[PDB]
Amino acid sequence: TSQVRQNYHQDSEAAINRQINLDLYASYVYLSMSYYFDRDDVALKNFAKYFLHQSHEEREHAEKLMKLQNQRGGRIFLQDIQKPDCDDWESGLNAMECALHLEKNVNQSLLELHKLATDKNDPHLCDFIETHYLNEQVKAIKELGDHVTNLRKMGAPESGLAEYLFDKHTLG
Amino acid sequence: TSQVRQNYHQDSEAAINRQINLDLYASYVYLSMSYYFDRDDVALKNFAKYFLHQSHEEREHAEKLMKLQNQRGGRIFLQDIQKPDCDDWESGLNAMECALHLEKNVNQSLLELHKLATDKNDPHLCDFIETHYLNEQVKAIKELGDHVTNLRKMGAPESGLAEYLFDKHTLG
Amino acid sequence: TSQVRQNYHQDSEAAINRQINLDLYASYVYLSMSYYFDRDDVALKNFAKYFLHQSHEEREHAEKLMKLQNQRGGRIFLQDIQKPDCDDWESGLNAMECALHLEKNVNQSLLELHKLATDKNDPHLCDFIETHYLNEQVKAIKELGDHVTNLRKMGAPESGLAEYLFDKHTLG
Amino acid sequence: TSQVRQNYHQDSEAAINRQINLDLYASYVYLSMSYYFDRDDVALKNFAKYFLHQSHEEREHAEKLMKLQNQRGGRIFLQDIQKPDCDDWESGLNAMECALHLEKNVNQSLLELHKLATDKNDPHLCDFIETHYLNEQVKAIKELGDHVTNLRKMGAPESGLAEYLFDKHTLG
Amino acid sequence: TSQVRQNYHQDSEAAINRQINLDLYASYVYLSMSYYFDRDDVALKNFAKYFLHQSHEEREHAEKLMKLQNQRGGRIFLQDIQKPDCDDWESGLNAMECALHLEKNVNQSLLELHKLATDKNDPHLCDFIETHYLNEQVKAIKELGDHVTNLRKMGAPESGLAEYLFDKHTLG
Amino acid sequence: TSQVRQNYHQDSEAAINRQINLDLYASYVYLSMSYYFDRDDVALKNFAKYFLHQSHEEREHAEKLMKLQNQRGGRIFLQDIQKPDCDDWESGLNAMECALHLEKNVNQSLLELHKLATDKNDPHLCDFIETHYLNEQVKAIKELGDHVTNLRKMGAPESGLAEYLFDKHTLG
Ligand SMILES: [Ca+2]
Ligand SMILES: [Ca+2]
Ligand SMILES: [Ca+2]
Ligand SMILES: [Ca+2]
Ligand SMILES: [Ca+2]
Ligand SMILES: [Ca+2]
Ligand SMILES: [Ca+2]
Ligand SMILES: [Ca+2]
Ligand SMILES: [Ca+2]
Ligand SMILES: [Ca+2]
Ligand SMILES: [Ca+2]
Ligand SMILES: [Ca+2]
Ligand SMILES: [Ca+2]
Ligand SMILES: [Ca+2]
Ligand SMILES: [Zn+2]
Ligand SMILES: [Zn+2]
Ligand SMILES: [Zn+2]
Ligand SMILES: [Zn+2]
Ligand SMILES: [Zn+2]
Ligand SMILES: [Zn+2]
Ligand SMILES: [Zn+2]
C-alpha cells in the first residue's frame, strides 16, 4: 500500500485507469478528425484546427487523471489506445455529430465514476470530478450541439457552401 | 572551363537553363491570370492579387536558378518566354485548376532534374533542388488542390456568389 | 487518386502510416515513463518532466507525418497505439536505457523509410526524412547515451543519491 | 464592348498591348545583363545590382500598362517575350551602351504611342503616357548617357580598373 | 561499439577523421596567408583580416566534424597538422589563387566523402555533408573566383595600386 | 633586413617561431581533450567546454606571437603542429594533470625565451613576454593545480560521482 493512500478504494483506482484510457481514446478520435479536414479533398482548415485543439485538450484531461492517480497513491495501468471507428469522417456536420456522441459517452463514464466515488464515500474524488470534468463536459456538449444546429440550419452536409462559411465565420 | 567549375556536368548545366525558362514561363502564366481577374467583367481583386504574388514568386525561382548556374560555373542561356496557352482564363475555379496543372508540370521537371543530378553524382545540385524547390512545389500543389476543392464544393464556376465569397474569405 | 498526388508510391504511403503509429507509440512510452517518476515512491520530478517533454515531442513528430501524408495526397490510416511493454520502469537509469533503445528503434524505422524512398526515387520524401527526422534522432540518441553514461558513472541504479543528484543537476 | 470603354480606339488598345510586350522585353534584357555581371569571370556586383533593379522596374512598367488596358476596357493580349540579342554583354561599358540604345528604343515606341493617342483625341491616354512614361525615359536616358561618358573617360572597356572603380564609386 | 552507434560504417568514421585533418590544415594555410599580409613589406591589412576570418571558419568546420564523429559514436583520431606548402605567398592575387585551389581540394574531399556515405547508405551523413559543407564550398569557391577575376582585371599582381585598391574597396 | 628591424637578434626571431609552434601545439592538445569529454561514454560537457576555451586561448597566444614577429621585422616560419601524445585522456583528473604538465612546459619555454631576450639586451621582447605571457602562465598553472587538488580530494578518478559534481559545481 502506498504511504500516501487514504480512503481510496481499489474500485475507484481501477475506474480512474479506465477513464485515463477513455480520455486518450477521445484525444485520438479528435486527432483523426483533425487530419481528415486537412485532406486536399476536404480542405476545411478551421475544422482541422478546432479538432486538433480538442485532441490536445483530451490528452490534457488524461494527464490530469494520471496525476490524480499518483496523488491518491493508486497505480497507473495503461491500455492500448484503440483506433477510432472511422477513417473517413464524411463532412463537417458528421464529424460534429460524432464529436457530440463522443463527449456524451465521456460524460456518461464520468457520471458513473462520480456515482462510484459517492458509493465509496470518497469526497475528494467526487470534488475532483465535479471541479475538473463535469462542467467541462456540459460546456463541450452544449458547444457541439450549437455547432450541429447551425450546420444543419445552414444546409449541411449537402451544401458545401454552408460548411465553407461555417468554417470561416464560426470556427475561424 | 570556368575557374569555379567542379563536378558540374554539361547535361546538368543545360537542364538548369531549361528550368530557368520554365520558371519564367510560370511567372508569365500567373501574370496573365492575375490581370484576367483585374478585368471589369471579372473583377475578383483577391484572385488578381493571389496570382500576381505567384508570378513574382516564380520570377524569384528563376533568378535563384540563374544565381545557381553562375555559382557552379555554368553559363546562362536564355530562351524566349512563350506566351501562355490562354488569354481568357474563364473563372476562378478554372484558373486555379490551370495553376494546379502548371505547378505539377513544374514539379515533374524539377523531379527530372533531381534524377539527372543523382545520375551525375552531383550532391550539391541534388541538395539545392531538395532545399529550395521540391518542398515549395509540394506546398504549392497542396494549396492549389485545397483551393480547387473549396471552389468546387461551394458551387463554382456556376455560382458567381461562390467565387465572390471565396475571393473575400480565403484569398482576402 | 488525389489531385495532388505526384511521384508518391503506395509503398511509401503505407510506410508513412506505419511511422505515424511508431511515433505515437513512442509518445505513449514516454508518457508512461513520465508518470512513473511522478509516483510518491519514485518522486524524481525532473525525470518526470524530461519524459513528459519527450512524449509531447513524439506526438509532434506524428502530427508532422500526418501533415506530410496529406501534403503528398496519401491517406492516413490509424492503428491502435499499443500500450508500452512496462508498467514499472525500475529506476532513472533503466528508463534512460529503455529510451535509448526506443530512439534507436525509431531511427532504424526511419532509415528503412529513407531506403524505401530512395528505392522509389522520391527525393521529396528523402529530404523530408533527412531534414525533420534523421538528425533529430542522432541528437536524441547522443543525449540519451550521455545520460546513461553519467548515471552509470555516478553509481545508479543502486545509488538513490546518484539518481537524486542527476535529477537536480542535469535534468533540472 | 466593355461597359467601361469610352473614347478608347482599337488602335490605341493594340498599341498598348505592343508596349506591354516591349516593356517585358526590356525587363528581360536587363535580367540577362544583370546575371552576366554575376559571372565569376566578370564579377561586378554593383553592375549586377543596377541591372537587376532596372529589370524589376521595367516589369513594373509593364504591369502598370496592363492595369491601364483594363482600366480603359481594352483586352490584354500577351505575346512571347523574345530572348535578348546577346548572351554575353562584353563589358560594363558595352552593357551600358546597350541599355542606352534600349531605353531610346522604348522612348521612341512611347512617343509613337503618344502621337497615336493624340491623333485619336484620347487625352487620358496622352496624360497617362506623359505622367508615367515620358519623363521616366528622359531621366533613364540621361542617367545612362552619364554612365557611358564616365566609363569612357575613365578608360573602359580596356581598363578593368576603370570598370572596377566605377562599380564601387558610382554604382555602389 | 559505442552505445549510440547506428548505421555508421568504419570507412565513414575513418573518412571523417581525414576530413577533420583537412579542415585543420586549411585553417593553418589561411593563418599563414593572413600573417603574410601583416608583414611590414606587404602591409595589406584587409587581406590579412579576410584570411584570418577564413582561418577561424575552417577551424569551426573541423570542430563541427569532431562533434559529428562523437554524435555518431565514432572515435576521433587526430593527426599532425602539416605546415602549408608556402612561407611567402607572393601577392594578394597569388594568395587568392592558392585559396581557390585549396577550397576546390577541400570540396573534392567532401564530394568523395558524400560518395562514400551514399555507397554505405548513410543518409544522415549524406545530409550532414550537404547541409553544412557542400553549399559552403560552392559559395567559397565562387567568392574566391570573383576575387581572382577582379584582381586580374585591375592589373594585379604587377600593379601594387590594384592590390591596394582591392584591399580597400572589396575587402575593407 | 626589414626596414622596421631594430635590436632584434636572429636567435630571438627563431625562438619566437618555436614558441608560436608550441602555443599552436597546446591549442591542439586542448582541442583533443575537449572532444574527449564530448564522447558519449565520457559525457562531461563542462570539462569539454573548459578545454575548448583553453584551446581557443592558446591559438590567440600564437596569433599574438605572430603579430609580434612581424612588428619586430622577423619572419614567421611555421612548422607542423604535432598531434597530441594521447587520443584517450582517461578521466577528468588525468586531463587536468596533463594540462598542468603542459602549462608548466609552456611556462618553461617562455622563461627560456625571456632569458634569451635578456641575454640579447632586448627589453621590448622581455616586456612583451612579462606583460602578455608570464603572469598568464602563473594564473593558468595555479588554476589547474587548484582543479587537480579538488578532484583528488573529492575522490577522482575512481569516483565518477566526484567528476560529475566537479563538472557541475566548478566548471559549470
Ligand atoms: Ca473536449
Ligand atoms: Ca484494436
Ligand atoms: Ca508558385
Ligand atoms: Ca510563340
Ligand atoms: Ca525524442
Ligand atoms: Ca495490445
Ligand atoms: Ca529603366
Ligand atoms: Ca525567338
Ligand atoms: Ca499633361
Ligand atoms: Ca573557407
Ligand atoms: Ca611535415
Ligand atoms: Ca538533403
Ligand atoms: Ca591556457
Ligand atoms: Ca608527427
Ligand atoms: Zn476528456
Ligand atoms: Zn462573410
Ligand atoms: Zn517555380
Ligand atoms: Zn519520434
Ligand atoms: Zn520601361
Ligand atoms: Zn572547411
Ligand atoms: Zn599559451
Curated annotation (Swiss-Prot), chains A, B, C, D, E, F:
Q: EC class of this enzyme?
A: oxidoreductase
Tissue-wise, where is it found? Expressed in the liver.
One Gene Ontology BP term is: immune response
Annotated phenotype, changing residue 103 to A: No effect on iron binding but the oxidation rate is severely reduced
> Which part of the chain is the Ferritin-like diiron domain?
6-155
Q: Which reaction does it catalyse?
A: 4 Fe(2+) + O2 + 4 H(+) = 4 Fe(3+) + 2 H2O
Question: Which GO MF terms does the UniProt record name?
Answer: ferric iron binding; ferrous iron binding; ferroxidase activity; identical protein binding; iron ion binding; iron ion sequestering activity
Q: Which family does it belong to?
A: Belongs to the ferritin family.
**PANTHER family hit by this protein:** FERRITIN, FERRITIN HEAVY CHAIN
Q: List the protein's name.
A: Ferritin heavy chain
**Species of provenance:** Homo sapiens
Q: Which gene encodes it?
A: FTH1
